[PDB]
């Protein structure tokens, strides 16, 4: 099994799988254990010294987690991956390992709300300078770069607007002018099936596994993906010391299980979303549809440059404010009123009347997060059913 | 009911249990879910705006985790608790939530290794200043206090030799010297069954639930306990943003399950360890035994004031060095060669040839570790079997 | 949610889902509990009397299991379903509830090996008469029917030959002549996505959920599906008393999770199998391919009569005996040498050198289970990878 | 090691543990897998042909389940054991594996309800003949023996009133009267910590592990224990074909976890129940208490011969009837209204208004159930709290 030459599905299914060498179990065993047994004091000493392979203690590493790490690194085309007990855990642990007091970060002004809060209010308590910029005007990006800029943090498509960012072109410019700077890309919305930021110049990829990679709405987990040199530091410092964000081995087993169908779900998510997006664009209550697959969309061709599929997140604005948005939220029958995304169940959320949250009213005016903006996570249901349900709720405001 | 007034076991078994109101199931359901459903758009807005309690999303809170949080707070006598995905996660999230660049921490110079690394190499990287002190020398502690000291961090009994710290004296001291200073006490080795730092004047208690609280060697998890106001910031800042240290609902279920027998397990751990410590002190291969229950122990009296039982951790020094520790390790048959503790299986490590193998013999003497020190977590087995196994191993190094 | 009018995927995803009315959890909670609490002695007495709804004790019923039961009944078009701790558990419990000492069974002579053993050696220890017949010659079927025939048991397509059986036409004839007789159909190989035997005249459907319905090779479970009147007896007698085959609530949660992608997996299983079957039919080491989707296949048009898709099990005979079969089993690199079926991983098994098992050498001569017969469970991998691996192993015997 | 020679707790904790040979993990891995991989086509043929041990497919056997099977066999002193997906599953699979149409069973007339239903209404439907007897009257037992009697089925102590059966006398009798007869003893209420029927001459022991063996109210499971030769047929016939009663590897993991504290839990269950039984007998609302540890108990001496401890089940009759039982049930605040037993939470049921509500007052008198009988499973709470809660409930019916 020189797995790396094979298809995506084969890699998702068989990649990183070591095998139960003692009983021959087909399925990955759940090594639900806190600690590990040494055969000798010498073997222990050598595991602690780095001389020998093998396991010590589940905060430091666990066989079930190792497999899903190796599987995702393989899918992203990265040397190494670390799995964490949440997406924010993988992001924080990566940021802690890469930065120190006095370093500087350039971030996108359009981010997942808790990433913005981590950057805006968290890292800045601890001596890290942060500048939020429009990643669509590279001159703005290039002028934010200071001699001590260590991370450029980007998310594409961006939660909640689906704004797309030229990964190759920011990476090139940053790498030309700041040789010490990492380019981080949050690839949650895409998964490696749709977008592989490491092939476009990114140095570090982060995911909320809570979303598409697990895919079943029963796991909180994250990953960081990148060079072995740096991921090793994320494991031995960001996770071991700074965050203690240890994925439960049972949760790792569930991510492995969900990744068995990652190819099939992303294909179905996206075919559903494209039908839904076209419906929304033609409905009389809708003013603007935000979707990478619509030719009307501002970042359509940047999406076509980086994304195999337009994805399965849709945002749209109703004619009418928050009030018409609330009316739709409160009368869908198949769509589920919840945050998160990437589940079998279609999810709908209305930042304007709920999570407008970690941003101030002004700070999301800058990012383009209007009231009346609805965000839709298109599920795996039959598309006619999703559309019928959206249609009945939208007809209420016509 | 008056659950606060009941016995300890009644509290461990029944405390924090909200109940399954839809189907009445006896066991706490595993709410293995990432997200939650809102009844209206406005309900979700109220919950995100702090105007209303209720669930939103498991990184911010989960019903299974809430239950074990409520149960441990009740046992510690604290107002609130947060469970994290590891001991270090609960420690780091608490420290992050109380500190900022420009703050100062006073810490014991005798701590769990990874706690020490986080303090010495981690927080100092981010503008926090840390002074390490010998907590036995109260005058040396009061001297290290600065006006920006925001955390005094203690661990008692501590690694690797079970040094005990006078919780009430130092906190009484710290509190009248600086009104804004949190006193942290790591209470892993004791659990609330043996020691309750908050009633001794501590502000925040941290736990590695990986050890005795879960007690079954199948969970990595942590807790912090204290005032509702601070724990809310540990949840909404330290967990939500800074660490992402989210316990799996499954792991919280297992911790709940493990806590049903905490009273019973702590009693047996301590009964066994008292017998093992007596035997080790009388054995000819053994130079010194560190056990709070032995009247030879330097902090015997102070431990007898703070701890309901002398615990079940044991450190002892062999007459000998690395080669001696290696032989004992490589010949125990019931005890298990493994780091960690608080397990039903008796665990044993020899740091000089194992955990502290990478360091030099001199650096290991800077960490309190002789070449003959052995650390012992006494399990739930029959004491005669534990002792017999230790006896034949140690007899191999008697001259 | 009048769910029954919606698409298959929507039903698989949302069907049977009650909802967490206390905390609003999206995912089904795991009610991992032995017993349930009464609010009053009166409420207890009424639950035991049948007067009140609600739960008593997990052998009698469990909320997590109730949901996957209701979900599968909805997909099959049956009134009720019971989930069991194995496929054999659902089959035995159904058979125990329907039969008594002195009743008679007509069964197909081509069956899953342990079903044959249950019928041939198990029920006959306990006074049940059993006659094994060729379900392809209805005159043979009709002549086996005795006045005391109570079950006609059939499996289509049959493990291991994939022989197809006219469900509508046996059901009609049996129902005309033996008004007291149940028609059981094992629908494991198809799932309700491909075949709905209750719509063709069957009275009872059984599944090994261990295979496609769970789909992830980490669960042993079964179902019976049928009229409420009879399923209620299976629950209160077959499961409660005769087998004690109680699905663990955690396993039920895993089946629910696997059914979220049942539509997507069956589509992918079958498109893969059709490509593999055509490859096998053209390879010089292969003498005969057994696959419903091949026009060469004996039961092609009976398959087209009953099956939306030709399925994803393939059997084939090599030119050469067991010896060439073993050579292929021992040199595949991506296919996994294991029994079971319906997993993400392609599985290959060689009854001739392994499980030829519960049949005698003669009894499978009658059913058509030759040596040199290989059975293939086509997985979810990329088809080129599955075919490349089969090709290299088969080339060894050319 | 000489695990057979060690103490009980050492056996419960370490017994049957094969070990994770690939990674050395301390906890038993959850082998949550349906199927297994063969190294060659011929290896799979050897395993299906009984020529070779090893795994095939989880309905035939799973490594997590094997471990808990080995552990329980060791505790009972039996050769082998099979775990099933419920108590009834292990009972039914054993009975199926030993009987056939034309066989005869002698059973106690005082059994667990669903066991009785299976015997009286289930097996008789399939040509098996069943005679129910009073096992206290040895002459009535020997009289019901027939040449085709293949099972003598016992349960001691039994529902609902804790009748004790002389295991060694009846089995000694049965064995010299009929050489091919299996003696079954249901050992649920005791566990191997208290009673071991195989050393008293029984052939097969059955368990509902749902009760004390798991002990945490989150598993439905069963066991049968006995000679390797019979248990192999229970596995390869009774489980594989006749019942399909396959334990989830996850459930087996939980039973293993629960058994780490079995010794500790049985001690506390019994200490608490002895205090609860004394209090109940002295209480004015209580007519009679059925407890093996009370010298008033009809089978006190026989129980003292067979049982290491008097157990933790308690039946008692109220001075009163259905209306009295209802009031007590509807006013306990710590005890839980629920069927089942062997849980860390104290459980209580009043059969006349609850489990046996569907039957008439006369049929319930045919089942040993007065209108004032209450069944009590004493938990792991503090005894004062259990008693206080029972006291205020019972005081509501004192004249
Ligand atoms: C939800 C989300 C996260 C947060 O990850 P968690 O698993 O919730 O900690 C991070 N990035 C993006 C783009 C998200 O949508
Ligand atoms: C093991 C330990 C910790 C760390 O907890 P983890 O759960 O391993 O992250 C902290 N303090 C003490 C005393 C410990 O023993
Ligand atoms: C594997 C199989 C079964 C047996 O079900 P289990 O889940 O293994 O008990 C029954 N029917 C068919 C067609 C099978 O392939
Ligand atoms: C509960 C019980 C059983 C039945 O076991 P289940 O696991 O519920 O199927 C059998 N015998 C006794 C004594 C019991 O208490
Ligand atoms: Cl989100
Ligand atoms: Cl540790
Ligand atoms: Cl199979
Ligand atoms: Cl019961
Ligand atoms: Na989902
Ligand atoms: Na699979």
CSV table of C-alpha atoms in Angstrom, one decimal, chain A residues 78-278:
chain,number,residue,atom,x,y,z
A,78,UNK,CA,1.1,17.8,4.3
A,79,UNK,CA,4.0,16.1,6.2
A,80,UNK,CA,2.2,15.9,9.5
A,81,UNK,CA,-1.0,16.6,11.3
A,82,UNK,CA,-2.1,17.1,15.0
A,83,UNK,CA,-5.7,16.4,16.1
A,84,UNK,CA,-7.1,18.5,18.9
A,85,UNK,CA,-10.2,18.5,21.1
A,86,UNK,CA,-11.8,21.4,19.1
A,87,UNK,CA,-11.1,23.5,16.1
A,88,UNK,CA,-10.2,26.5,18.4
A,89,UNK,CA,-7.9,24.1,20.2
A,90,UNK,CA,-5.9,23.4,17.0
A,91,UNK,CA,-5.9,27.1,16.0
A,92,UNK,CA,-4.8,28.3,19.5
A,93,UNK,CA,-2.2,25.5,19.9
A,94,UNK,CA,-0.8,26.4,16.5
A,95,UNK,CA,-0.7,30.1,17.2
A,96,UNK,CA,0.9,29.5,20.6
A,97,UNK,CA,3.6,27.4,19.1
A,98,UNK,CA,4.4,29.8,16.3
A,99,UNK,CA,4.3,33.2,18.2
A,100,UNK,CA,5.7,34.9,21.2
A,101,UNK,CA,5.3,38.2,23.0
A,102,UNK,CA,6.4,40.9,20.6
A,103,UNK,CA,5.5,39.1,17.4
A,104,UNK,CA,2.9,40.5,15.0
A,105,UNK,CA,0.0,38.9,13.2
A,106,UNK,CA,-1.8,40.1,10.0
A,107,UNK,CA,-5.3,38.6,10.0
A,108,UNK,CA,-8.3,38.8,7.7
A,109,UNK,CA,-11.0,41.1,8.9
A,110,UNK,CA,-13.6,38.4,8.0
A,111,UNK,CA,-13.3,35.4,10.3
A,112,UNK,CA,-15.2,32.9,12.3
A,113,UNK,CA,-16.4,34.9,15.3
A,114,UNK,CA,-14.3,33.1,18.0
A,115,UNK,CA,-11.2,33.2,15.8
A,116,UNK,CA,-11.6,37.0,15.6
A,117,UNK,CA,-12.1,37.1,19.4
A,118,UNK,CA,-9.0,34.9,20.0
A,119,UNK,CA,-7.0,37.2,17.8
A,120,UNK,CA,-8.6,40.5,18.7
A,121,UNK,CA,-8.9,40.0,22.5
A,122,UNK,CA,-6.8,37.0,23.4
A,123,UNK,CA,-3.4,37.1,21.8
A,124,UNK,CA,-3.3,40.9,22.4
A,125,UNK,CA,-3.5,40.3,26.2
A,126,UNK,CA,-0.2,38.5,25.9
A,127,UNK,CA,2.0,40.9,23.9
A,128,UNK,CA,1.1,39.8,20.4
A,129,UNK,CA,0.3,42.6,17.9
A,130,UNK,CA,-2.6,41.9,15.6
A,131,UNK,CA,-3.7,43.9,12.5
A,132,UNK,CA,-7.0,43.1,10.7
A,133,UNK,CA,-7.0,43.8,7.0
A,134,UNK,CA,-9.0,43.2,3.8
A,135,UNK,CA,-7.4,40.2,2.2
A,136,UNK,CA,-8.9,41.2,-1.1
A,137,UNK,CA,-6.7,44.3,-1.4
A,138,UNK,CA,-3.2,43.0,-1.4
A,139,UNK,CA,-1.8,46.5,-1.1
A,140,UNK,CA,-3.6,46.7,2.2
A,141,UNK,CA,-2.2,43.3,3.1
A,142,UNK,CA,1.3,44.2,2.0
A,143,UNK,CA,1.3,47.5,4.0
A,144,UNK,CA,0.2,45.8,7.2
A,145,UNK,CA,3.3,43.6,7.1
A,146,UNK,CA,5.9,44.7,9.8
A,147,UNK,CA,9.4,43.3,10.2
A,148,UNK,CA,8.1,41.3,13.1
A,149,UNK,CA,5.1,39.8,11.3
A,150,UNK,CA,5.2,36.1,12.1
A,151,UNK,CA,1.7,34.8,11.0
A,152,UNK,CA,-0.6,35.8,8.3
A,153,UNK,CA,-4.0,34.2,9.1
A,154,UNK,CA,-6.6,33.6,6.4
A,155,UNK,CA,-9.9,31.8,6.0
A,156,UNK,CA,-11.3,31.1,2.6
A,157,UNK,CA,-14.2,31.1,1.9
A,158,UNK,CA,-14.7,33.3,4.9
A,159,UNK,CA,-17.4,32.6,7.5
A,160,UNK,CA,-20.0,34.3,7.0
A,161,UNK,CA,-19.8,36.1,3.7
A,162,UNK,CA,-18.0,33.4,1.7
A,163,UNK,CA,-15.4,35.9,0.6
A,164,UNK,CA,-12.6,34.1,-1.2
A,165,UNK,CA,-8.9,34.9,-0.8
A,166,UNK,CA,-6.1,34.3,-3.4
A,167,UNK,CA,-4.0,31.8,-1.4
A,168,UNK,CA,-1.2,31.4,-3.9
A,169,UNK,CA,-0.8,35.2,-4.4
A,170,UNK,CA,-0.8,36.2,-0.7
A,171,UNK,CA,1.5,33.4,0.1
A,172,UNK,CA,4.0,34.4,-2.7
A,173,UNK,CA,4.0,38.0,-1.6
A,174,UNK,CA,4.3,37.2,2.1
A,175,UNK,CA,7.0,34.7,1.5
A,176,UNK,CA,9.0,37.1,-0.7
A,177,UNK,CA,9.0,40.0,1.8
A,178,UNK,CA,8.8,38.2,5.3
A,179,UNK,CA,10.9,35.0,5.1
A,180,UNK,CA,10.1,34.2,8.8
A,181,UNK,CA,6.3,34.4,8.4
A,182,UNK,CA,3.9,31.5,8.4
A,183,UNK,CA,0.8,31.5,6.2
A,184,UNK,CA,-2.1,29.9,8.1
A,185,UNK,CA,-5.3,28.9,6.2
A,186,UNK,CA,-8.5,27.8,7.8
A,187,UNK,CA,-9.7,25.1,5.4
A,188,UNK,CA,-12.8,24.1,7.4
A,189,UNK,CA,-15.4,25.1,4.8
A,190,UNK,CA,-13.7,23.2,2.0
A,191,UNK,CA,-12.0,20.1,3.3
A,192,UNK,CA,-9.0,18.7,1.3
A,193,UNK,CA,-11.5,17.2,-1.1
A,194,UNK,CA,-12.3,20.7,-2.4
A,195,UNK,CA,-9.2,22.8,-1.6
A,196,UNK,CA,-5.6,22.0,-0.6
A,197,UNK,CA,-4.0,25.2,0.6
A,198,UNK,CA,-0.6,23.6,1.2
A,199,UNK,CA,-0.3,23.1,-2.6
A,200,UNK,CA,-1.0,26.8,-3.1
A,201,UNK,CA,1.8,28.1,-0.8
A,202,UNK,CA,0.2,27.9,2.7
A,203,UNK,CA,2.5,26.7,5.4
A,204,UNK,CA,-0.1,25.6,8.0
A,205,UNK,CA,-3.7,24.4,7.5
A,206,UNK,CA,-6.2,24.3,10.3
A,207,UNK,CA,-9.7,22.7,10.4
A,208,UNK,CA,-12.6,22.5,12.7
A,209,UNK,CA,-13.2,18.8,12.4
A,210,UNK,CA,-16.5,19.5,14.2
A,211,UNK,CA,-17.9,20.4,10.7
A,212,UNK,CA,-17.4,18.4,7.4
A,213,UNK,CA,-14.5,16.1,8.3
A,214,UNK,CA,-16.4,14.4,11.0
A,215,UNK,CA,-19.7,15.2,9.2
A,216,UNK,CA,-22.1,13.8,11.7
A,217,UNK,CA,-22.6,16.5,14.4
A,218,UNK,CA,-21.5,14.3,17.3
A,219,UNK,CA,-17.8,15.4,17.7
A,220,UNK,CA,-16.0,18.6,18.7
A,221,UNK,CA,-12.5,18.4,17.3
A,222,UNK,CA,-9.8,20.2,15.2
A,223,UNK,CA,-6.6,19.6,13.3
A,224,UNK,CA,-3.5,21.5,12.3
A,225,UNK,CA,-1.6,20.3,9.2
A,226,UNK,CA,1.9,21.2,8.1
A,227,UNK,CA,5.6,20.4,8.2
A,228,UNK,CA,6.8,17.8,10.6
A,229,UNK,CA,9.1,20.3,12.2
A,230,UNK,CA,6.3,22.6,13.2
A,231,UNK,CA,3.6,20.1,13.9
A,232,UNK,CA,6.0,18.4,16.3
A,233,UNK,CA,6.2,21.6,18.2
A,234,UNK,CA,2.4,22.0,18.2
A,235,UNK,CA,2.2,18.5,19.7
A,236,UNK,CA,5.0,18.9,22.3
A,237,UNK,CA,4.1,22.5,23.3
A,238,UNK,CA,0.8,23.9,22.0
A,239,UNK,CA,-1.1,20.8,23.0
A,240,UNK,CA,1.1,19.3,25.7
A,241,UNK,CA,1.5,22.6,27.7
A,242,UNK,CA,-0.3,25.6,26.3
A,243,UNK,CA,-3.8,24.3,25.6
A,244,UNK,CA,-4.1,20.7,26.8
A,245,UNK,CA,-6.6,20.2,24.0
A,246,UNK,CA,-6.4,16.4,23.8
A,247,UNK,CA,-8.9,14.7,21.5
A,248,UNK,CA,-10.6,11.8,23.2
A,249,UNK,CA,-9.7,8.5,21.5
A,250,UNK,CA,-13.4,7.7,21.1
A,251,UNK,CA,-13.9,11.1,19.3
A,252,UNK,CA,-10.9,10.2,17.0
A,253,UNK,CA,-12.6,6.9,16.2
A,254,UNK,CA,-15.7,8.9,15.2
A,255,UNK,CA,-13.7,11.2,12.9
A,256,UNK,CA,-12.1,8.2,11.2
A,257,UNK,CA,-15.5,6.7,10.7
A,258,UNK,CA,-16.9,10.0,9.3
A,259,UNK,CA,-14.0,10.3,6.9
A,260,UNK,CA,-14.9,7.0,5.3
A,261,UNK,CA,-17.7,8.9,3.4
A,262,UNK,CA,-16.0,12.3,3.1
A,263,UNK,CA,-15.8,12.1,-0.7
A,264,UNK,CA,-19.5,11.0,-1.0
A,265,UNK,CA,-20.8,13.7,1.4
A,266,UNK,CA,-18.9,16.6,-0.1
A,267,UNK,CA,-20.2,15.7,-3.5
A,268,UNK,CA,-23.8,15.4,-2.2
A,269,UNK,CA,-23.4,18.6,0.0
A,270,UNK,CA,-22.3,20.6,-3.1
A,271,UNK,CA,-24.8,19.3,-5.7
A,272,UNK,CA,-27.5,20.1,-3.1
A,273,UNK,CA,-26.2,23.6,-2.4
A,274,UNK,CA,-25.9,24.5,-6.1
A,275,UNK,CA,-29.6,23.6,-6.6
A,276,UNK,CA,-30.5,25.5,-3.5
A,277,UNK,CA,-28.4,28.6,-4.4
A,278,UNK,CA,-30.1,28.8,-7.9
